[PDB]
Write a protein that binds this ligand. Structure first.
Ligand code: NAD
Ligand code: NAD
Ligand code: A1IU5
Ligand code: A1IU5
Lengths: 344, 343
């Protein structure tokens, strides 16, 4: 066994991770159902067509849904996987509140079925792409891996917590499993080529893609949800990690599995949070554009500040984020300007 | 319209099917026989006997809640008003050994049920939960304000995760009505003696193990600890007569018609019983001596855990009538009439 399955590998973090896997000398097999990825003019998703050009290496790809048991069984019989990196899922928080059953079905049932097939095929090596929203509202900052988990405020976050708990119980029951749960906040930026990046369908949910679309002329003005928080400038402080650093952390996790590590949990991040206005300022600097905004009411449930402590990963995974705020913004801008409408 | 009872061939479900018929509802049961006994015809033996006890028909389909196609066809074939959901895996000790089976049956089965309910406009649910979702007690008796989610095994986690999914569904869609019923250990049996709990592989409470004793199929009960902070030093736990429990599921079903949204109620007698109290009550009911041996505690067991059922009295109009002596008398009658259960 010598392939790495990457579920959801056509998406934002997955496509960057497939690139890093290829550059690191692994042999990926990617599956995706195109729920949130654009089709290319050939078989590959456009993101992965471009990854093949960027790396000079071929991407093995199957269009399939991880909810389809028969397809998943056939996949694991056809390929000999040594590990799985699991990105396939739904991840829009506001959508999760409106459509909880879809989130529980894709995220929970999808992951359970993946685990069941992995077990059946003796593939017991997993990197799970988790979320630091599993810590709930912060009780101390920065959040480290000892901080309590649970008490999530939306179905997305609850789904990620529930999956973590299931994996932890699986590993307790069977000490031959190795699983690395990676917790992080907001992936930002893009591969330095500007050829791939986050390609939101419709009006972006999140700050940075919205700000980039204001800068390019695609959107009127940003809404800033509250400026009366207990933060330096009154706007909320959040944690942003360059997607390339994040992708490299998934490769470091894959290496940790080879140590027969059992169940391990690591935060990934830079260790420093930024306010909404700090991100807007840095995007004006990178883009050379004004980014108008208006301050509106706080959203119910939003906390003043949340950011992660990446010290454990810096020791045990050998991983450090190299790319700071200006690089995140410069790389997002380059993707945006080179691809004003995204992939399509 | 009919009432679907998932897992209705099993212990609590069969008693609830009987109470549905006694209350004037039309039951349809699904079960995969994972943990129930087949009759000599098309019905589970439990349900064949329920038909005799009531004089009424039970409709039954053998199927797995994990089979989406079977569930879709079920909801097209019958017109349901509501669902009472018992189908699941429930042995706490088994869940530690085989967690993925518990998550798959309990989580994926429930999610698929909720999605098919939604797809057919059936938005009224009674979920049979577990008071283990409270975790180790921080105060007693446990009421519905007590913290939840501190669960100590995969079974309890799965029940808590289901509750959270249902709460989020009800938040997203105010037209859903769902009653989540939390309780501890069902015991006893229908007073006919004709139905009860079949022999279990991995019991959650001491009363059958005990019932295997008084009849002579075990030597002595092991008592796990006699040094707890309890009246008599043995652990105090919460036991509800299965007939009272079943009737609480009917009260929950009626509450849905009030367009109650999401509601959560504990069911129980309101008083816990120690191990020695259970042994003494069983000796009284059976007329047999029940030897025991005190052994070390099991790691992680707490001194006492029992629920406050006051809110159910106020909002469901429900109380448990049957105390410990009646639980033991009714268990003993089932055991005497059916020493190996339905088999
Ligand atoms: N983006 C974030 O802010 C963030 C933060 C923390 C964790 N995560 C996690 O990262 C993962 C990837 O996030 P992303 O930002 O790249 O999102 P994304 O939507 O770009 O990528 C997810 C990919 O999964 C695919 N997919 C969805 N459902 C699938 C299914 N049933 N079968 C097969 N493929 C399916 C999508 O088509 C998409 O290409 C998810 O697990 C998410 O929870 C993301
Ligand atoms: N017995 C307890 O200690 C206890 C305590 C609290 C809550 N509960 C809950 O009560 C319910 C019923 O408990 P019970 O004591 O009557 O147990 P039981 O095992 O007698 O009944 C459950 C029934 O579900 C069926 N079933 C299991 N998996 C199924 C599947 N995939 N598809 C269809 N049917 C399936 C079984 O065959 C069985 O007849 C469960 O939801 C459980 O979590 C039980
Ligand atoms: O602007 C938007 C979406 C992007 N806006 C965003 O993420 N802002 C934020 C984020 C936060 C965090 C909570 C405290 C810190 O605080 N402010 N959408 C929109 C704009 C204009 N018209 C309609 C829709
Ligand atoms: O007796 C048995 C099993 C039944 N015994 C039981 O549940 N007792 C208990 C339960 C509790 C609770 C924890 C504190 C309250 O406290 N004691 N098993 C056995 C006997 C002999 N040989 C092998 C196995």
């Amino acid at each position: 066994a010598e392939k790495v399955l990457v579920t959801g590998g056509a998406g934002y973090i997955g496509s960057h991770t497939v690139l890093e896997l290829l550059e690191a000398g692994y042999l990926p097999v990617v599956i995706d159902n195109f729920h949130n990825a654009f089709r290319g003019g050939g078989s590959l998703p456009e993101s992965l067509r471009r990854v093949q050009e960027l790396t000079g290496r071929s991407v093995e790809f199957e269009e399939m849904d991880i909810l389809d048991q028969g397809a998943l069984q056939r996949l694991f019989k056809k390929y000999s996987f040594m590990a799985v990196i699991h990105f396939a899922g739904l991840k829009a928080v506001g959508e999760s509140v409106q459509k909880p059953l879809d989130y529980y079905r894709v995220n929970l049932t999808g992951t359970i079925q993946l685990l069941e097939i992995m077990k059946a095929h003796g593939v017991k090596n997993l990197v799970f792409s988790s979320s630091a929203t599993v810590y709930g509202n912060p009780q101390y900052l920065p959040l480290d891996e000892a901080h309590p988990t649970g008490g999530c405020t939306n179905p997305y976050g609850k789904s990620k917590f529930f999956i973590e708990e299931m994996i932890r119980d699986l590993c307790q029951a069977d000490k031959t499993w190795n699983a690395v749960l990676l917790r992080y906040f907001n992936p930002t930026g893009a591969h330095a080529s500007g050829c791939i990046g986050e390609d939101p369908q419709g009006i972006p949910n999140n700050l940075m893609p919205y700000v980039s679309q204001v800068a390019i002329g695609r959107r009127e003005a940003l809404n800033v949800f509250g400026n009366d928080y207990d933060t330096e400038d009154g706007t909320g402080v959040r944690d942003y990690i360059h997607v390339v650093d994040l992708a490299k952390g998934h490769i470091a996790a894959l290496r940790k599995l080879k140590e027969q590590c059992g169940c391990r949990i690591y935060n990934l991040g830079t260790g420093t949070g930024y306010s909404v206005l700090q991100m807007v300022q840095a995007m004006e600097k990178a883009s050379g554009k004004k980014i108008p905004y208006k301050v509106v009411a706080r959203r119910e449930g939003d906390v003043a500040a949340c950011y992660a402590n990446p010290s454990l990963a810096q020791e045990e995974l050998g991983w450090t984020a190299a790319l700071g705020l200006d690089r995140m913004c410069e790389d997002l801008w380059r993707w945006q300007k080179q691809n004003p409408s995204g992939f399509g």
